[PDB]
Design an enzyme around this catalytic site. Structure first.
Site, short mmCIF file in Angstrom:
data_model
loop_
_atom_site.label_atom_id
_atom_site.label_comp_id
_atom_site.label_asym_id
_atom_site.label_seq_id
_atom_site.Cartn_x
_atom_site.Cartn_y
_atom_site.Cartn_z
N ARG A 291 -1.74 3.11 -11.35
CA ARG A 291 -1.23 4.44 -11.63
C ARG A 291 -0.59 4.57 -13.00
O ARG A 291 -0.60 5.66 -13.57
CB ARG A 291 -0.21 4.84 -10.56
N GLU B 70 0.82 -1.21 0.00
CA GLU B 70 0.00 0.00 0.00
C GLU B 70 0.86 1.26 0.00
O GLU B 70 0.76 2.11 0.88
CB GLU B 70 -0.97 0.00 1.18
N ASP B 71 1.71 1.36 -1.02
CA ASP B 71 2.60 2.50 -1.26
C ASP B 71 3.53 2.73 -0.07
O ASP B 71 3.47 3.75 0.60
CB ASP B 71 1.80 3.77 -1.58
N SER B 72 4.39 1.75 0.18
CA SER B 72 5.38 1.85 1.23
C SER B 72 6.74 1.47 0.67
O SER B 72 6.86 0.99 -0.45
CB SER B 72 5.04 0.96 2.42
#
Ligand SMILES: [Mg+2]
Ligand SMILES: [Zn+2]
Ligand SMILES: [Zn+2]
Ligand SMILES: [Zn+2]
Ligand SMILES: [Zn+2]
Lengths: 79, 43, 44, 184, 576, 115, 55, 49, 420, 257, 64, 48
Positions: free
Chosen positions: I269, I98-100
């Site tokens: 994205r 999760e975008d880490s």
RNA sequence: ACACCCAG
């Protein structure tokens, strides 16, 4: 006598009765069930609820104004 | 700007990055109120 | 209580009531020297 | 049973929402009792009928022996007793499900326990629960024959706007004009 | 004036009575932590040592609270205050002698928050009920809050510098309310749409698609390393699916140990063919797409977001309705721990090689775009000369725009289907779309084949100049390139005219995001303050504040939405 | 601010304990060896050396949290063999392996440097 | 202010928001109240102190 | 104005500094270019109200 | 009639630093241009002379390996912001979800993204007033009557802390005494946490003619868990975990990546330009020259960079066979790894962490104050009161809004209902 | 008594790096030796820095950071000294640490490069390894850097400045004979330098009854311990950790009787 | 500001190679061969010298 | 002055010459008869 | 009070 509400015990009565019982036992109330070593008053109150020994009468308010006095040992435990 | 006409025109220079300093020196600001829910001048 | 001038970098020995004023070059920016107590820096 | 559902459901959409999963807890009863579907069962069909009748009387939503209360009780659990009588009928239990006597007794008890556990608890703020549940999936549609549909439609629908943006009808034809393009 | 003090958002009523600043709250940045349970939260040591929980001294814990007082406010865990029975409060950072440090019955010790403490964890746009959920405190030393990955979906929290509040209950009655009403396991299934609002997301979902394939096999040492992370494990190694050439366990056997109880569920994979349900191989699957779990054991099927996700009737939903909240909580953690540690062996990645198509696909894409451009040019030539008959219901210009958009949308769909036809099973864009973890089939089409037609305010790119979209085009050019169609892909690179048109659809998506949020938030406010007092009374009639019957039974049946499922009526479809 | 000291990953100060043995009640003859202030360096070799033992049925190690410094090794053996003796034999075989590997490495340095 | 030791001056703990005496550690009075502005205006400009106090 | 990079460094001023900002009370203040509707030009609009 | 000089001149200043902007989705390019104004680096070359109230300076700012031809013109070559990072887009143990970002601890210990944080504290003495006198002097407990819980020992006799002295939370750096209409004590204090070393102390005469002082407090901000890191394509994220070099995966030649990001951050994205930059960086680092990432350069495509990478013994699509750092086994998939320019953003977890047990209350509301700067309390807003109603927890809702915020008692008449 | 018998073959032994091959060994033992190279081999690095005067454009605790990363040779000293936390002195003693003194003043007009030759140590055989040299700070005329530093003993778990290894490369089975990694297109991937395959072939066939048996190492030092001394100290370090675990285990077995 | 003492990725010493790298570039070497002559085989050490900017040259222009 | 912009609206028969400040301009090359006026002699002069 | 900015 003349009781028309649900005999089952709702989630909100389970929250308040366990909350009130845990606060009472923490204030040096007499424990109503034998304990095997529990110290946290939440776990003691859960043991009292599963043993049907909590000395609390739930008063349910019908909309018309009348009230029904239900003892916790008379309600079916949802858990 | 007066002496209630305009407000928030002069800003403290955003001296955090050289890219930020250059971007802040070349900034255009529109007079449309930010409480207006219109979308015609934002596209 | 000694200060370092910002231009000539010379000590000034300014007291508590002496105005900020360089005794040599005439400059009005002063910097305090490093303290005599030594601070431990870990190399991490 | 069938003629009532033809009135209630005219479009034939049989995907409804009901508390107890009848097709799954039957499968539960097959697996926990190790029921062999090849061997014949030992479950009496009249025991099924009396079992369903006793189960239908044991699930109460509107409590009371008054004729007004009994009519409201029948109507409140009408659709569930439609599904209960359809799924737990004598023909399906003797042919497809093939549950035994002990498995049927466990199934009736478990349906009663699951239905009584699905009753809406008194004191629940369903009004605040509904509008959170009705405004949370209001952040997942795109804004604007064209028709207003989305947040502007939701904004218009709950305001009761006396002038709409795109009002419309859906006119249906009754007689031969429906089947013929010339008269339409 | 007085009116300005009482009205609007920052006034006395809305800003200080309906909602007000509170004590015993913390805020910091969130970071992932898959080694916790769903009901556990990581708390920094400085946050836990700063704010306290008042514990009433009883003879059950007279010794433990005395030790916490003696430690003081310098060694975590410790105590910060001693609230006396008569109301006096003694701070422990100023009193050195033990004259008043002795605790008797009735005192209150404000000990630091320790392990097993109950807190409310809240994400700041509190949209639905599953945004004020209650967790359990686990102290892990660093400066961030930690969440399990399965609770990110109800909060709608990514870990890109989101920050969330942590409210700590003070009295013992409020701790019990959070424990029996709003914990993480008790809020798995929402009453909004009777489906589990939680699920399996991102790396755990992609690898469980890989872990339940038919071709994956585990060695002897890999199984007993995987089984070490199983909380509900019986302790007995199961019989391998392959014995004699080498002892091998399939991935479905290990997930069968993860699945709790003896639940039953039949789901379908995302790549299930339509004709398989009626063909000869109906109950044996060539593509291994029919998911069936029988007697708590996975028999066949490849798991995805349609079996382990938020979909109604999924394997998590069956686990909650059969076993309970506590067992389903262990089901979530055992999926995440076992799959992630197998993902350390299998691995998962994405790169340029996952976007490159072969020379046949690029030639087929270029042929379809060239044919679609010739089709649009033919339509424009047929519309310049008066040869295009207007369709009923619209003018000629909107008829022309509908015909051009139909051709260009068919071009994007055809080039999209051509691009995903030539994707190998080892392609990782396909590996995270068929699992449904992140992305979709339109994203692969945009990366590989064409970006597609790009629209601003519904229609195409308007004539902002005098009858021109950009100065590089001719006047009155209704072709695809001039009006916004992007014939290039992200991998090939956009032309400068197509790049500017892409910045317009991207901007229009951002303007929609800001305007819709400011409107829907007011829709949400109005919608619920009108009916926030509506409550199911004890005679099971839905009533408002002034005791007027809204519904005779809640939802016309008296059943809550948490324990209802989607079913099928068997006596409505068949004929007589 | 909340940064732990870097030496807490491999020191035991006053209060902790290097190794503890807890019996596992799930299956007979199983132990949960809890080792403090270690990492995957010792957990991997102990698991592999126990796996080569033909008379040990289960051998696996886990780290409950990478931010903590605890490993848990679960050993289940045959009913005629104590799990504690399996752990001791696994360590002893690894020491005899590494000491011989060091001696064979020292010989190969001498052979390479001499010509 | 302290009952047992009234002579000692009270030290202020603005982080903990209470009045504590430094001998026996008893918290006297009530929670501290900030005299500054709550925002970061509903107040006016101050009177010029050298200008005489008028209206 | 018109100073070499060596002379700018001697004045304790960065040569890479683009300038373009005022210094008021010691704070660097930049004037953001305000946008207005163009004057002197006749305009026709489409007020649907 | 007219022709464009170059089409990459339609971009701005912060959008010109994006390598291959045409390969990205447009919301990703907008997000990076916001974050490009927040990247940490040497913001100006005379930062050792200027005394700014905020100032972030990175230790080792590197020019991008994959650069745009406009970077020679915005002076990003001379004053860069960010470090070229060996980034492997792998799905590792689960801390990059999760975008880490999973970040190499041994890299951070070697100077990776480690930056100082200069903060300044201006203060001036006000000699004006008919009675009040305001003099820089070291306060004394006997005379001053306005102190609180802090140590007045690090000061000097002048009233200023000396440079090279460590400070912590609730520490005094200005000896500031004002005469009562003997003297009350109000002084400038360090904020919560903000531990550091006083760099230099500066005294002058300001524009008003009064005695002026300025202290710059310097603190090293080592990257830790929670620091916000973003690439040059809008791939924001926070440092999920810090693994040592022996725990991170390693290439067969012994290269352990400094940053591991989610493979799941790419497809929703479509930051394909991030993949191209990460593959151009391998060619630029191996061939030896700084690569070209002009936005509309038709002579540079994916196939040409792929063919150049195949001449250096690597896989032509940029993948490499990483071994697992824990067990030593080969990872079955082949991780895409290469040098990618990353930036550290000023949004740091030590500037954001905030907690409050019980603190100061407002003069008007008797409620907790606003924000960490004054040790305030988080707002239990209308949306939160709303959700606790739907939960049904009534005592917790009462505890939040009555017991834990502002409990009060009033006395009320019974004939009328007016406060008595 | 079920320990396998490992053999060592060394191909390249230079001053900066060593190449050796370990055969007949489990994967976990070879992986553990690799991570002991990085984190469990003690060397001597500067950890305690005390700065008296620093007029450079680099601040004090950035000079201390660059001083700690400077490698000091400890080829026969790191065994003699014990850890400063296990010594008997109150802060620091010459028996458990070494003292470094730096004193550079720039009076010439040219830029003075404060390199690693200017670190004067009291111990004659604990010096910076480059004594071009490692640059610390560049000094303009009029800037003085005077400091004294202490160097402890530590390994790579505590900090990366105590890491003797500068790029160990661990490789097993370069022909992909065990299919531990699965190539999508095996013809694209270049052959490893240890591969023993023909040019037309690209991947070895599957081995059913196979295990990782041969490992290849490329241990490279950044100075400090020599290449051969790193591996010899690593195998003693891992043996010492296993002997310490065996002593504590036998203690706890004896306790629970 | 200044060349790092150690490579960020692997830890190889690159602090002593910055002065030699500038000397090789001044002697008309390409950047690829200048890095190869200094012994940097891995691309992690190559990017440490190639992507480094020397801000200490501009920092030393100001008076102390 | 080079910043002065002159616009011909042929379909309306209007000529607008704008001189005042506030206009926003960018440089472009000049193409006459499909040939750039920027010959090679301008690049070689600009390269020195 | 205003500007700037973080998250959705
Ligand atoms: Mg976010
Ligand atoms: Zn002077
Ligand atoms: Zn009265
Ligand atoms: Zn000593
Ligand atoms: Zn390197």
């Amino acid at each position: 006598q003349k009781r028309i509400t649900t005999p089952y015990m709702t989630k909100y009565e389970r929250a308040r009765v366990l909350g009130t019982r845990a606060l009472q036992i923490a204030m040096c109330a007499p424990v109503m069930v034998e304990l095997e070593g529990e110290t946290d008053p939440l776990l003691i109150a859960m043991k009292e609820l599963k043993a049907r020994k909590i000395p609390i009468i739930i008063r349910r308010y019908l909309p018309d104004g009348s009230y029904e006095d239900w003892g916790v040992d008379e309600l079916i435990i949802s858990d | 700007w007066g002496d209630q006409a305009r407000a928030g025109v002069s800003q403290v220079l955003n001296r955090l990055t050289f890219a930020s300093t250059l971007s802040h020196l070349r900034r255009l600001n529109s007079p449309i109120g930010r409480d207006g829910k219109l979308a015609k001048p934002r596209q | 209580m000694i200060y370092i001038c910002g231009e000539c970098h010379t000590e000034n020995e300014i007291k508590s009531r002496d105005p900020i004023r360089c005794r040599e070059c005439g400059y009005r920016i002063m910097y305090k020297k490093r303290t005599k107590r030594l601070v431990v820096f870990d190399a991490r | 049973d069938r003629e009532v559902l033809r009135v209630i459901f005219p479009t034939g959409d049989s995907k409804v929402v009901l508390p107890c999963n009848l097709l799954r807890m039957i499968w539960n009863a097959q697996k926990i009792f190790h029921i062999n579907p090849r061997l014949p069962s030992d479950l009496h069909p009249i025991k099924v009928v009396e079992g369903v009748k006793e189960l239908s009387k044991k699930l109460v939503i509107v409590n009371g022996d008054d004729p007004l209360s009994r009519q409201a009780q029948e109507n409140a659990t009408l659709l569930f007793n439609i599904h209960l009588r359809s799924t737990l009928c004598s023909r399906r239990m003797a042919e497809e499900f093939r549950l035994s006597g002990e498995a049927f007794d466990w199934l009736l008890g478990e349906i009663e326990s699951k239905f009584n556990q699905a009753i809406a608890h008194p004191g629940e703020m369903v009004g605040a629960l509904a509008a959170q549940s009705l405004g949370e999936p209001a952040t997942q549609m795109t804004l604007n024959k064209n028709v207003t549909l989305g947040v502007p439609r939701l904004k218009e629908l709950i305001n009761i706007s006396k002038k709409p943006k795109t009002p419309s009808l859906t006119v249906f034809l009754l007689g031969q004009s429906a089947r013929d393009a010339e008269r339409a | 004036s007085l009116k300005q003090r009482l009205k609007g958002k920052e006034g006395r009523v809305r800003g200080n009575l309906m909602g007000k600043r509170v004590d015993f709250s913390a805020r910091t940045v969130i970071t992932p932590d898959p080694n916790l349970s769903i009901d556990q939260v990581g708390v920094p040591r400085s946050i836990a040592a700063n704010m306290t929980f008042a514990e009433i001294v009883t003879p059950f814990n007279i010794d433990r609270l005395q030790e916490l007082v003696r430690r003081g406010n310098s060694q975590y865990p410790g105590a910060k205050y001693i609230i006396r029975d008569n109301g006096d409060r003694i701070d422990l950072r100023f009193h050195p002698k033990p004259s008043d440090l002795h605790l008797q019955t009735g005192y209150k010790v404000e000990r630091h928050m320790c392990d097993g403490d109950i807190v409310i964890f809240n994400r700041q746009p509190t949209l639905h009920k599953m945004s004020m959920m209650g967790h359990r405190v686990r102290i892990l030393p660093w400066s961030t809050f930690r969440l399990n990955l399965s609770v990110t979906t109800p909060y709608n929290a990514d870990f890109d510098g989101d920050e969330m509040n942590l409210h700590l209950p003070q009295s013992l009655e409020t701790r019990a309310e959070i424990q029996e009403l709003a914990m993480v396991p008790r809020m798995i299934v929402t009453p909004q749409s009777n489906r589990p609002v939680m699920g399996i997301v991102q790396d755990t979902l992609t690898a469980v698609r890989k872990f339940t394939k038919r071709d994956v096999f585990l060695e002897r040492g890999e199984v007993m390393n995987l089984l070490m992370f199983l909380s509900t494990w019986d302790g007995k190694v199961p019989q391998p699916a392959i014995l004699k050439p080498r002892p091998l366990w399939t991935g479905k056997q290990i997930f069968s140990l993860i699945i709790p109880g003896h639940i039953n569920c039949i789901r379908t994979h995302s790549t299930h063919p339509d004709d398989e349900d009626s063909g000869p191989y109906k109950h044996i699957s060539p593509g291994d797409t029919k998911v069936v779990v029988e007697n708590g054991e996975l028999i066949m099927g490849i798991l995805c977001k349609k079996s382990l996700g938020t979909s109604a009737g999924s394997l998590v939903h069956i686990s909650y309705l059969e076993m309970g909240h506590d067992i389903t909580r262990l089901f979530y953690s055992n999926i995440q721990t076992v799959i992630n540690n197998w993902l350390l062996i299998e691995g998962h990645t994405i790169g340029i090689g996952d976007s490159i198509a072969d020379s046949k696909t690029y030639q087929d894409i270029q042929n379809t775009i060239k044919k679609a451009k010739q089709d649009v040019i033919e339509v424009i030539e047929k519309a310049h000369n008066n040869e295009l008959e207007p369709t009923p219901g619209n003018t000629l210009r909107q008829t022309f725009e509908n015909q051009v958009n139909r051709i260009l949308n068919d071009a994007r769909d055809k080039t999209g289907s051509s691009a995903q036809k030539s994707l190998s099973e080892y392609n990782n864009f396909k590996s995270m779309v068929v699992s449904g973890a992140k992305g979709s089939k339109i994203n692969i089409s945009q990366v590989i084949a064409v970006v597609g037609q790009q629209n601003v305010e519904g229609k195409r790119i308007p004539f902002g100049f005098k009858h021109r979209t950009l100065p590089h085009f001719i006047k009155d050019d209704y072709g695809p390139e001039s009006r916004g169609f992007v014939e290039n892909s992200y991998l090939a690179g956009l032309t400068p005219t197509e790049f500017f048109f892409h910045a317009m659809g991207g901007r229009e998506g951002l303007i929609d995001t800001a305007v819709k949020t400011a409107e829907t938030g007011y829709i949400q406010r109005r919608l619920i303050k009108s009916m926030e007092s509506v409550m199911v009374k004890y005679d099971a009639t839905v009533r408002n504040s002034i005791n007027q019957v809204v519904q005779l039974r809640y939802g016309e049946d008296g059943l809550a939405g948490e324990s209802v499922e989607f079913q099928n009526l068997a006596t409505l479809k068949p004929s007589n | 601010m909340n940064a732990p000291p870097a030496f807490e990953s491999f020191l035991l100060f006053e209060g902790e304990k290097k190794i503890t043995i807890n019996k596992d009640t799930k299956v007979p003859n199983a132990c949960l060896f809890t080792i403090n202030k270690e990492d995957h360096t010792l957990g991997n070799i102990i698991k592999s050396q126990l796996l080569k033992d033909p008379q040990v049925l289960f051998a696996g190690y886990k780290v409950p949290h990478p931010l903590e410094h605890k490993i848990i090794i679960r050993v289940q053996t045959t009913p005629d063999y104590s799990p504690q003796e399996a752990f001791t034999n696994a360590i002893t075989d690894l020491i005899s392996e590494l000491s011989l590997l060091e001696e064979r490495f020292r010989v190969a340095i001498k052979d390479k440097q001499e010509g | 202010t302290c009952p047992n030791h009234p002579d000692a001056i009270l030290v202020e703990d603005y982080r903990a928001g209470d009045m504590i005496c430094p001998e026996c550690g008893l918290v006297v009075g009530d929670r501290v109240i900030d005299v500054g502005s709550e925002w970061r205006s509903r107040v006016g400009d101050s009177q010029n102190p050298l200008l005489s106090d008028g209206d | 104005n018109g100073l070499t990079d060596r002379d700018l460094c001697e004045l304790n001023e960065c040569p890479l500094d683009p300038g373009g900002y005022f210094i008021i009370n010691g704070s660097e203040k930049v004037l953001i270019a305000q946008e207005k509707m163009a004057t002197n030009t006749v305009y026709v609009f489409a007020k649907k109200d | 009639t007219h022709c464009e000089i170059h089409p990459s001149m339609i971009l701005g200043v912060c959008a010109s630093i994006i390598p291959f902007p045409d390969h990205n989705q447009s919301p990703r390019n907008t997000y990076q241009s916001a974050m490009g104004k927040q990247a940490m680096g040497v913001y100006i070359t005379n930062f050792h002379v200027r005394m700014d109230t905020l100032a972030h300076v990175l230790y080792y700012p590197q020019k991008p390996l994959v650069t745009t031809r406009s970077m020679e013109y915005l002076r990003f070559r001379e004053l860069p912001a960010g470090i070229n990072s060996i980034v492997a887009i792998a799905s590792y143990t689960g801390y990059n979800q999760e975008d880490s970002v999973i970040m190499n601890r041994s890299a951070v210990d070697r100077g990776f993204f480690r930056s100082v944080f200069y903060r300044s504290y201006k203060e001036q003495e006000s000699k004006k007033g008919f009675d009040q006198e305001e003099v820089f002097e070291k306060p004394t407990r006997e005379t001053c009557q306005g102190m609180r819980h802090a140590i007045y020992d690090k000061l000097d006799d002048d009233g200023l802390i000396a440079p090279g002295v460590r400070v912590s939370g609730d520490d005094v750096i200005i000896g500031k005494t004002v005469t009562l209409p003997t003297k009350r004590d109000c002084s400038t204090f360090l904020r919560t946490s903000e531990t550091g070393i006083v760099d230099q102390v500066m005294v002058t005469l300001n524009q008003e003619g009064y005695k002026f002082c300025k202290i710059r407090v310097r603190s090293v901000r080592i990257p830790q868990i929670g620091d916000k890191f973003a690439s040059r394509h809008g791939q924001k994220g926070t440092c999920g975990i810090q693994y040592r070099q022996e725990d991170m995966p390693f290439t067969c030649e012994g290269i352990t990546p400094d940053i591991i990001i989610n493979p799941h951050a790419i497809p929703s994205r479509m930051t394909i330009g991030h993949l191209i930059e990460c593959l151009q960086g391998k060619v630029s680092a191996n061939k030896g020259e700084i690569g070209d990432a002009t936005p509309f350069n038709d002579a540079v495509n994916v196939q040409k960079i792929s063919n150049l990478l195949s001449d250096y013994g690597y896989h032509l699509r940029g993948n490499e066979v990483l071994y697992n750092g824990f067990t030593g086994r080969k990872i079955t998939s082949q991780i895409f790894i290469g040098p990618t320019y990353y930036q550290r953003l000023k949004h740091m977890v030590d500037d954001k962490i905030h907690s409050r047990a019980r603190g100061p209350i407002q003069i008007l509301n008797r409620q907790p104050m606003e924000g960490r700067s004054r040790d305030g309390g988080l707002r239990f807003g209308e949306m939160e009161r709303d959700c606790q109603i739907a939960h049904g927890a009534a005592q917790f809702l009462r505890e939040r809004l009555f017991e834990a915020s502002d409990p009060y008692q009033v006395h009320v008449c019974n004939l009328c209902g007016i406060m008595a | 008594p079920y320990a396998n018998q490992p053999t060592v073959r060394i191909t390249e032994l230079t001053d900066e790096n060593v190449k050796f091959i370990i055969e007949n060994t489990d994967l976990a033992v070879a992986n553990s030796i690799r991570r002991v190279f990085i984190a469990e081999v003690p060397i001597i690095a500067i950890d305690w820095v005390q700065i008296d005067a620093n007029s450079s454009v680099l601040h004090d605790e950035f000079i201390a950071h660059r001083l700690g990363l400077i490698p000091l040779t400890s080829d026969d000293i790191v065994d003699k000294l014990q850890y400063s936390r296990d010594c008997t002195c109150e802060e620091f003693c010459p028996e458990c640490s070494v003292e470094f003194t730096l004193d550079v003043r720039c009076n010439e007009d040219q830029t003075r490069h404060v390199t690693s030759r200017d670190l004067i140590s009291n111990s004659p055989r604990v010096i910076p390894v480059t004594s071009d040299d490692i640059l610390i700070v560049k000094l303009r005329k009029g800037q003085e850097l005077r400091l004294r530093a202490y160097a402890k003993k530590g390994f790579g778990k505590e900090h990366a400045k105590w890491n003797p290894t500068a790029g160990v490369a661990f490789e097993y089975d370069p022909d992909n004979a065990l299919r531990h990694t699965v190539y999508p297109k095996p013809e694209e991937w270049p052959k490893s330098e240890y591969s023993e395959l023909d040019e037309d072939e690209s991947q070895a066939p599957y081995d059913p009854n196979g295990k990782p048996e041969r490992f290849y190492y490329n241990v490279e030092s950044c100075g400090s311990l020599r290449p051969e001394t790193i591996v010899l100290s690593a195998l003693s370090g891992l043996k010492k950790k296993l002997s310490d675990l065996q002593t504590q285990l036998s203690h706890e077995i004896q306790s629970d009787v | 500001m200044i060349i790092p003492v150690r490579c960020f990725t692997c830890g190889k010493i690159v602090g002593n190679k910055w002065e030699a790298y500038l000397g090789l570039l001044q002697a008309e070497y390409t950047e690829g061969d200048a890095l190869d002559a200094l012994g940097l085989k891995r691309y992690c050490c190559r990017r440490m010298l190639l992507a480094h900017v020397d801000l200490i040259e501009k920092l030393l222009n100001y008076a102390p | 002055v080079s910043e002065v912009s002159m616009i011909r609206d042929i379909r309306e028969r209007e000529i607008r010459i704008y001189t005042d400040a506030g206009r926003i301009c960018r440089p472009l090359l000049i193409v006459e008869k499909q040939k750039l006026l920027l010959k090679k002699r301008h690049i070689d002069q600009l390269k020195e």
